Design a protein around this ligand. Sequence first.
Ligand code: HEM
Length: 153
Amino acid sequence: VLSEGEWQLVLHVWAKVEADVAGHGQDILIRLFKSHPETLEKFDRFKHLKTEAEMKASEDLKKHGVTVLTALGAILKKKGHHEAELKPLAQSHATKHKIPIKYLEFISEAIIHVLHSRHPGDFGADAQGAMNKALELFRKDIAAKYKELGYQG
Ligand code: HEM
């Protein structure tokens, strides 16, 4: 599992995320869309946006970046005991939204990238390794639920 020392690394940087959830949410979703354009097409609500400036100006996008981060934070602060939190999420993502597990890998990379951009002094190698573990645990447990439902990635 993650050790208590790894969790403390993750939650320290996350409490910095929380100082500016909306800005972090925007940078993370813009990175995802720009790096992996296919992901934008999953969003009926956002697929009209074509340029980075248009993405930055959308209030709605910033609102959904808050939704995402707020759910992610709730999961993180359970420290691996996130069975309840994860169940609704993997259900809508598998069945309603149809999000492949690979795209969850992509958003994981975009979170890590942004956290390094914004918080270098608290996001050294040790905190990066810890965060990457925590995101892998999130993926692995969601992947298990997808398997059960018959969408595995
Ligand atoms: C940290 C990773 C993610 C978290 C915590 C997350 C969380 C959420 C939450 C809580 C909602 C709203 C409730 C829902 O229907 O379950 C949501 C909706 C949605 N998510 Fe995710 N999601 C994540 C990754 C993704 C990815 C990678 C995509 C697409 C490539 C995606 C696509 C959607 C879509 C399409 C909606 C519906 C948006 C709308 O029509 O309102 N999510 N997200």
